[PDB]
Amino acid sequence: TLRAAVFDLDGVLALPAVFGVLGRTEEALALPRGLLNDAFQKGGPEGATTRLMKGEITLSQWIPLMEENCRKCSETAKVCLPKNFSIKEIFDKAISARKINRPMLQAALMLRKKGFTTAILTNTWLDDRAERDGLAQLMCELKMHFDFLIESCQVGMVKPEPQIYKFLLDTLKASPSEVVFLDDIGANLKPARDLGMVTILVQDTDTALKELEKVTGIQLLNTPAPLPTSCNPSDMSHGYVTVKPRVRLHFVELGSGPAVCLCHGFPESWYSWRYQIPALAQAGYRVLAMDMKGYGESSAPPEIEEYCMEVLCKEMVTFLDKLGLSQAVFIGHDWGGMLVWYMALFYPERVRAVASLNTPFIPANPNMSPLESIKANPVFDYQLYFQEPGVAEAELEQNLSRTFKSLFRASDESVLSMHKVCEAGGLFVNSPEEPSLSRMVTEEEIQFYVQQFKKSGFRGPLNWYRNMERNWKWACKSLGRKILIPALMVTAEKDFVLVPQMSQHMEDWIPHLKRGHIEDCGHWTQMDKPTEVNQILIKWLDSDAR
C-alpha cells in the first residue's frame, strides 16, 4: 500500500529538462551527436559534474571545467566548437526557460491532499551565478507544496549511488514498497526499483500520470480545476505595529515587490484573503493582509468614535509611516472597500493604486442625512439593527459557529435575508440553530473565525456602522475632488446588498476607472470565486500598479 510519492525535478516537476539542452545545442550548432552530453558526464563518478552535484564545488567553479571537457571531446571527435561557444550562456537560458510542469505539480498536490507524503529528490548544484535568483524563485514556488526537498548538493550524495535512496527512505520513514518514485533518467530509477519501490519512467507527463493514477488508485488526470493555494495561519509571518497608545495593528506578510495592502470587510479577518495572499506574492508583490481595527490580533478599543473613517484612515497612514512605506496599493472588500476609496480621496500620495471588491464609490449627499439614505433602501434595514450598542453584539456573540455558518454562504445556499431585520427582531431569527456547511468553507476555516472572534467579539466590528453622521460630514469635505490615481471596481453579480448597479455612475468621479465583474458570485467574493478574483487583481496590478 503506497503512502509516499517522490518526484525528480528536471524533466519531471520542471520543463523543459536542462539535460535536454545539450542535445538541442549540438543540433543547432551542427556538432557531433552526444559531444556535449559526453563532455557533461566525462570522468563519471570522479568527474567535474559529480563534484558539482555532491556540493564539492559551485556552478561557477564548474563552468570552466565543463568548457575544458568540451575541448577534449571535440579533439577526439576531430571537430571544432563555435567561437561564440559559452557554457555560461547555454546554461543561463536553459535554467531560465525551465518552468513548473503544472499537471505534475497538480498530481503531487492531489496526492498530498489524499494523505500521501510528498518529496522532491534532485541532483542539483550550488548556484552562485549572477542570475541565480530565477532558479531560487522556482525552487521556492515548488518546495512549499511538498513535505521534503532533498538536494544532492546539500546531502553530499548523488543518484544513482544507493546511499541517497537509503537517505530518502529514512527521511520518508517508509519501506521501499510504500513509495512511488518518478524519474526521467532510467539509470537513476534502477536503484529505487532494485530496493523494491514502485517506479515510473517519465517521458511525456500524460502517460506518466496514467501510470501514476493506475498504481495509487487516485484520479489525477482530467480532474476538475483546483482551488488556488490557501494559507496555513501558523506558517505565516505575523507583523504588529503600534499606531497610537493602546492601538496596535496586526498583519500577515508574504512576498517581495510593491506593497499591496489587503483590507477585509465585516465581520471578517486577514484570513478572508487566504486564496489571494500566495497568488499575489507569486505574482511579484509584497502582501500585507490586515486584521482591520476591531478584529483578530489588532486592538479593539470600545469607543464608537475610534471606528469613524477619518480615524481609521489616519491610522492606516501611521501604519505606512511606522513600516517605512511611502505608498501601498490598497485593495479592499466590503467595509475595507469603503476605507480604500477614502484613502484615495484624502491621502492620494500614499496610495499607489486603489481597488475595491463589491463596494462602490458614491459621493456623500449633503441634502440628505445618512440615516434618511439608509431608510431609502430596504436591503439596508440590518444597518439600523446594528445601531443600538449591545443589541447585535448579543445575537452575533451568542453562538459563534452559527454566526459564521449563517453569514458565509454562496448564492446557491439559502442566503440570509436582509429585509425586515428590525421587525423580525434579529439577523438569524428565521435561521436554523445548526446551519449546514457552505461549499465555500471547511469546518476548520469556520473554527479559525470562531477563535479570532473570541478575543474582542463584535463591539469593535459593529462600531464601523455607528459613525454614519461623522463619516458623512468628513466625506462632504471631498465633494469637489476626483479620484484620478489608478482605480479598479470589481462587481459581484449576485451580491444583493452591494449590487453591481449601485456602481454605475462611478466614471463621473473616477473617469479613468477600470472594471472587473464576477458572474454567479455572492457577497463573500474572495472565497466564492478565488480563481476569478486572483485573475482580475493580478492583471490589473501588472498593468496599473507596476
Ligand X SMILES: O=C(Nc1ccccc1)Nc1ccccc1
Structural element, H or E, at residue 149: strand 148-151
Q: Among residues 272, 290, 276, 14, which one has the least CA distance to residue 140?
A: 14
Cα 370 from chain centroid?
38
Q: Shortest distance, CB of residue 136 to a second copy, whole angstroms?
A: 4
Site residues (CB under 8 A) for a second copy, limited to 15-74: 51, 55-58, 60-61
In sequence order, what are the residues at sequence separation of 6 or more whose Cβ sits closer than 8 angstroms to the Cβ of residue 155? 55, 164, 167
From the list ligand X, a second copy, none, pick the one residue 352 interacts with, judged by a Cβ distance below 5 to 8 Å according to partner type: a second copy
Structural element, H or E, at residue 237: strand 237-244
Mind giving me the DSSP string for 482-524? ---S-EEEEEETT-SSS-GGGGTTGGGT-TT-EEEEETT--S-
From the list a second copy, ligand X, none, pick the one residue 259 interacts with, judged by a Cβ distance below 5 to 8 Å according to partner type: a second copy
- Check residue 127 for interaction with a second copy (CB under 8 A): yes
Site residues (CB under 8 A) for a second copy, limited to 267-306: 281, 286-287
Q: Select the span of 136-144, 332-340, 455-463, 471-479 touching ligand X (CB under 6 A).
A: 332-340
First CA to last CA distance, the chain: 50
Q: Nearer Cβ to a second copy, position 229 or 463? A: 229
Q: Among residues 96, 24, 90, which one has the least CA distance to residue 62?
A: 90
Distance CA 140, CA 118 (A): 15
Vertex 126 angle, CA 123 and 131, to 5°: 115
Mind giving me the DSSP string for 190-206? HHHHHTT-EEEE-SSHH
Q: State the amino acid at position 471 in one-letter form.
A: N
Which one among 82, 481, 505, 542 touches a second copy, defined by CB under 8 A? 481
Virtual CA dihedral for 276, 545, 250, 242, nearest 10 degrees?
180
The answer to whether residue 523 is catalytic is yes
- What nine digits make up the cell of 347? 491621502
Q: Select the span of 111-119, 125-133, 407-415, 442-450 touching a second copy (CB under 8 A).
A: 125-133
Q: What mask, x for binding a second copy by CB under 8 A, covers residues 380 to 419?
A: ----------------------------------------
Q: Select the span of 136-144, 333-341, 441-449, 454-462 touching ligand X (CB under 6 A).
A: 333-341
Per-residue burial over 450-462, b if 16 or more Cβ lie within 10 Å, else e, is bebbeebbbbbbb
User: 8 labelled as ligand-binding?
Assistant: yes
Which one among 251, 266, 307, 449 touches ligand X, defined by CB under 6 A? 266
Look-up of cell digits 446594528: 386
User: 271 labelled as ligand-binding?
Assistant: no
Which one among 163, 256, 398, 504 touches a second copy, defined by CB under 8 A? 256
The answer to whether residue 334 is catalytic is yes
Q: Shortest distance, CB of residue 466 to ligand X, whole angstroms?
A: 12
User: 123 labelled as ligand-binding?
Assistant: yes
In sequence order, what are the residues at sequence separation of 6 or more whose Cβ sits closer than 8 angstroms to the Cβ of residue 176? 169, 192, 195, 196, 197
Q: Nearer Cβ to ligand X, position 251 or 404? A: 404
| HSE-up (13 A, CA, CB side) for residue 440 | 25
Q: Nearer Cβ to ligand X, position 272 or 359? A: 359
Q: Collapse the DSSP code of 2 into the 3-class scheme (helix H, G, I; strand E, B; otherwise coil) and give the result.
A: coil
Structural element, H or E, at residue 328: strand 328-333
Structural element, H or E, at residue 180: strand 179-183
Q: Select the span of 130-138, 264-272, 405-413, 529-537 touching a second copy (CB under 8 A).
A: 130-138
The answer to whether residue 92 is catalytic is no
Which one among 164, 179, 259, 488 touches a second copy, defined by CB under 8 A? 259
Site residues (CB under 6 A) for ligand X, limited to 334-373: 334-335, 338, 359
- Check residue 466 for interaction with a second copy (CB under 8 A): no
Q: Collapse the DSSP code of 230 into the 3-class scheme (helix H, G, I; strand E, B; otherwise coil) and give the result.
A: coil
Choosing from 127, 291, 334, 381, the catalytic residue is: 334
Q: Shortest distance, CB of residue 260 to a second copy, whole angstroms?
A: 12
Which one among 68, 75, 89, 128 touches a second copy, defined by CB under 8 A? 128
Look-up of cell digits 461623522: 470
Which residue numbers are catalytic? Answer: 334, 465, 523
Binding-site residue numbers for substrate are 382
Binding-site residue numbers for phosphate are 122-123
Tell me which residues touch ligand X (CB under 6 A). Answer: 266, 334-335, 338, 359, 407, 497
Tell me which residues touch a second copy (CB under 8 A). Answer: 51, 55-58, 60-61, 126-128, 132-133, 135-137, 139-140, 143-144, 154, 156, 234-242, 253-256, 258-259, 281, 286-287, 321-327, 346, 348-350, 352, 477-478, 480-485
